[PDB]
């Protein structure tokens, strides 16, 4: 996906809603986050 | 804390201090772990 494209050298930088993950951080470096948010659920009321 | 880190007296600093442009230029900050920022507290006036 996007991470593989970045690692393959096709992409030089990524700007997208990419959630910071430890496994991703092992091979990629994340800058200071521009926003903070968690995970919820969506359901019809 | 910032001066202590700059003076190399302490190699690590954790004191619930925020991150700012004037702070990140002199010392390095890792990924933040607690969400915070600038907020305002007001009384309970109705």
Determination method here? Answer: cryo-EM
CA gap B6, A13 in Å, rounded: 31
Helix, strand, coil content of chain A in percent (nearest 5): 25, 0, 75
How many other C-beta atoms are found inside a 10 Å radius of the C-beta of residue B8? 7
Terminal C-alpha separation, chain A: 34
Q: Which of A36, A37, A39 to mutate to test the interface with B (most CBs of B within 10 A)?
A: A36
Which of A36, A40, A39, A16 lies closest to B37 in space, CA to CA?
A36
Asked if B29 lies within 8 A of A20 by C-beta distance, the reply is no
What's the resolution in A? Answer: 4.3
Terminal C-alpha separation, chain B: 41
Whether residue B2 contacts residue B27, with contact meaning beta carbons closer than 8 Å, is answered with: yes
């Amino acid at each position: 996906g996007m991470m593989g494209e970045l690692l393959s050298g096709q992409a030089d930088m990524i700007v997208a809603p990419l959630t910071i993950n430890n496994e991703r951080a092992q091979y990629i470096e994340f800058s200071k986050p521009f926003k903070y948010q968690g995970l919820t659920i969506l359901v019809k009321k | 804390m910032i001066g202590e880190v700059v003076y190399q007296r302490a190699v690590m600093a954790v004191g619930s201090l925020t991150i700012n442009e004037e702070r990140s230029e002199v010392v390095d900050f890792s990924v933040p772990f607690v969400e915070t920022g600038i907020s305002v507290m007001v009384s309970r006036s109705n």
